[PDB]
Each structure stands twice: as structure tokens, then as C-alpha cells.
Amino acid sequence: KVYNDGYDDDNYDYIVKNGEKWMDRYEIDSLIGKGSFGQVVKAYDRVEQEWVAIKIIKNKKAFLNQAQIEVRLLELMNKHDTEMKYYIVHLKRHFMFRNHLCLVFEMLSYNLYDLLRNTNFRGVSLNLTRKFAQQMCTALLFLATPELSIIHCDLKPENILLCNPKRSAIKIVDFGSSCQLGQRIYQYIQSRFYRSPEVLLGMPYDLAIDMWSLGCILVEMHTGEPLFSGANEVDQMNKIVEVLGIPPAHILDQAPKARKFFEKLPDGTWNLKKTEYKPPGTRKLHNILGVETGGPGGRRAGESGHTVADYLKFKDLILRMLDYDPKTRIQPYYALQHSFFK
Numbered sequence: 001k002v003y004n005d006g007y008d009d010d011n012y013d014y015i016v017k018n019g020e021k022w023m024d025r026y027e028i029d030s031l032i033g034k035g036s037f038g039q040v041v042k043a044y045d046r047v048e049q050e051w052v053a054i055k056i057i058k059n060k061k062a063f064l065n066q067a068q069i070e071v072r073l074l075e076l077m078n079k080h081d082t083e084m085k086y087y088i089v090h091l092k093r094h095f096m097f098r099n100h101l102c103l104v105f106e107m108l109s110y111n112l113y114d115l116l117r118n119t120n121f122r123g124v125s126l127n128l129t130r131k132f133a134q135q136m137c138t139a140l141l142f143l144a145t146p147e148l149s150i151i152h153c154d155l156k157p158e159n160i161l162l163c164n165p166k167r168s169a170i171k172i173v174d175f176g177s178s179c180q181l182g183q184r185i186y187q188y189i190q191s192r193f194y195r196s197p198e199v200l201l202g203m204p205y206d207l208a209i210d211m212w213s214l215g216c217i218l219v220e221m222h223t224g225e226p227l228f229s230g231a232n233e234v235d236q237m238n239k240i241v242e243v244l245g246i247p248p249a250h251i252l253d254q255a256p257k258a259r260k261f262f263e264k265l266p267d268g269t270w271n272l273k274k275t276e277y278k279p280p281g282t283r284k285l286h287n288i289l290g291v292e293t294g295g296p297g298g299r300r301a302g303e304s305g306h307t308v309a310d311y312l313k314f315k316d317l318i319l320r321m322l323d324y325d326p327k328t329r330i331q332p333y334y335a336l337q338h339s340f341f342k
């Protein structure tokens with residue numbers, strides 16, 4: 001039982017070895033990430049004299065073909081001149097090495113989930129959250145470039161990395177599972193916590209599903225907990241409704257999976273199917289954010305930049321991101337014009 005001459009394990013993953021030299025160029029330091037696609041390695045590039053992250057794709061057609069699509073999107077994105085591209089992780093180059101496709105990315109620092117973990121899931125300031133909010137909106141404006149029209153499709157704290165551990169600059173990484181506007185190919189998409197209503201109801205969707213994700217992420221960044229932490233899709237929708245109420249009838253009348261979560265009563269209105277929740281719309285975002293009670297858990301009482309006014313602008317922006325209708329849900333260009341960023 002030997003795989004690819006001893007270089008691979010039984011999952012077609014490359015057996016990583018610390019200190020290994022590739023092509024008299026890359027000095028492999030250690031394994032820093034792992035996934036179904038394969039592995040991510042820290043390394044030093046002798047030619048450019050810089051630390052890089054090498055994503056080593058499994059030696060398997062399924063995963064190689066997926067990675068070739070990633071490479072297309074990244075190169076497509078990195079070609080565009082506009083400065084909005086410096087919120088996407090840079091793909092420096094790619095190559096084949098002992099039958100594994102290898103993507104060389106710039107090396108970034110911690111991810112926003114690490115950040116939350118350090119606070120013991122109590123969150124970061126509204127002032128830091130604003131900075132992240134603006135940069136993420138700018139990155140979405142970029143993905144909305146008509147010639148790109150890219151749906152990241154899986155936005156979450158662990159996919160948003162800091163450039164430098166002492167600055168607020170962030171970049172979105174991992175477009176491996178990244179949809180693109182067009183004919184619908186997929187329906188089970190996004191990570192559950194950040195999955196939009198249109199996806200849950202099996203409806204048409206577009207770039208607006210990333211905006212939904214962002215709304216959930218920003219609240220999470222300031223409280224430290226996920227806004228909608230569903231253990232399954234029923235739980236997920238039920239938690240969304242707690243805060244936002246029953247979705248509008250005109251959406252549910254069209255929703256193919258409306259009946260997974262709701263029933264249409266004889267009077268024509270929609271209610272939740274019974275399955276431990278607060279009534280629709282009664283777990284108010286106002287109170288989740290602690291608008292008038294000194295922020296979440298009162299921990300921001302007396303910190304500057306956390307007044308009622310400051311919280312009202314943030315709350316308003318968030319609600320416009322969590323619009324049930326993806327046609328009127330706020331768009332990136334308008335997000336950046338909001339009072340919360342002035």
C-alpha cells in the first residue's frame with residue numbers, strides 16, 4: 001500500500017514534511033490548515049524573499065478541477081485594475097508539484113474567528129467593527145463588478161483574515177466553493193449560521209446572499225456570538241424569525257420549501273409549523289446589540305463611540321442587510337453611503 005510513490009497518504013493528500021525544499025525555491029515550514037480540498041502549508045519563497053501560504057490540492061480529479069475554477073476566479077479578480085481588489089487575498093502564482101496542484105497565496109495573519117476566540121466570544125468594539133464593515137462592503141462592491149459578478153457563497157469570520165496582526169486591514173480568502181451569477185446549479189449552499197432566507201426556502205438567489213452573510217457577521221463581530229446559530233435548517237429559520245418576524249407572504253407563496261418551516265392557514269396567512277422559541281419579531285436586534293444598555297452585556301458602558309446614536313446607525317445598516325427580500329436588501333454601493341460610515 002503505497003500512494004503516488006510514497007508522497008501521498010490514502011486520501012491523496014501530500015505527506016507534509018517540515019524543512020522540505022521544493023524546486024530549489026520553497027522552504028516548507030509547517031501545516032497551518034486542512035480541508036476536503038487538501039492542505040495549506042506555511043512556506044518561505046527564496047526568490048521573492050517572503051513568507052507565503054501554499055494551498056496543496058489533493059491528487060484527485062474532483063478536487064483539482066474545483067481548484068482550477070478557483071484559480072480562474074482569482075486571476076480574473078487580480079487582473080482588474082481597480083483598488084477594490086486589495087480586499088481579496090492575492091494569488092501570486094500556481095504550479096504542479098509531484099502531481100498536486102499548488103496555489104501560492106500571500107501570507108496573512110489571524111482570522112476574525114481567532115479574534116472572537118481571544119475575547120472569549122465577547123466581541124470587538126463598534127469602532128473596529130465599522131472598519132471591517134466598510135472594507136467588507138468595499139470588497140462586495142468589487143465582487144459586484146458586472147464583468148465579475150462573483151458570489152463568495154460562504155462568508156464567515158474564519159474566512160476573513162487580517163493582513164497584519166497590528167492593523168485593521170482585512171482580506172477575504174477561499175473562493176474554492178464560490179458560486180457565480182447565472183443558471184442555478186446549487187441549492188445547498190453557504191454555512192448554516194450565515195445562510196440566507198432565499199437559500200433556505202429553495203428560491204432564486206444572487207449576490208445579495210453574501211450581503212445577508214455580512215449582516216450576520218458584523219453583529220457577531222460586536223457581540224462575539226453568532227446571530228443565528230441553528231443546529232439544522234428548521235432551527236435556523238426559527239431563529240431568523242425570532243429577530244425578523246415571519247417572512248412576507250409574497251415570498252412564501254413562491255418558496256418551493258415554504259412547507260419545511262411554515263404552514264398556510266385557512267385565512268391565507270403563513271405561520272410557523274410547530275416542532276422552544278420566542279414569538280415572531282420579539283427577540284429584538286435593538287436588545288441584542290444593547291443599544292440603550294451599554295452595548296452587548298453592558299461591557300461597552302462608557303467607552304467612546306458607543307452612544308445610542310452610534311448604535312442606531314449600526315442597527316439601521318444591519319437591518320437593511322437582513323432584509324427578507326433580496327431585491328431591496330441593501331447593495332454595496334449604498335451600504336458605503338450609510339451614516340454609519342461618516
Ligand SMILES: CO[C@@H]1[C@H](N(C)C(=O)c2ccccc2)C[C@H]2O[C@]1(C)n1c3ccccc3c3c4c(c5c6ccccc6n2c5c31)C(=O)NC4
Nearest residue numbers: 032033034040053055105106107108109113158159173174
Ligand atoms: C482560511 O483559512 C483556513 C483555515 N481555517 C480558517 C480553519 O481551519 C478553521 C476552520 C474553522 C475554525 C477556525 C479555523 C486556517 C488556515 O488554512 C485554511 C484552510 N486556509 C485557506 C483555505 C483556502 C484558501 C486559502 C487559505 C488560507 C490562507 C492563509 C491561511 C492561514 C494563515 C495563517 C494561519 C492559518 C491559515 N490558514 C490559511 C488558509 C493565508 O495566509 N493565505 C491563505
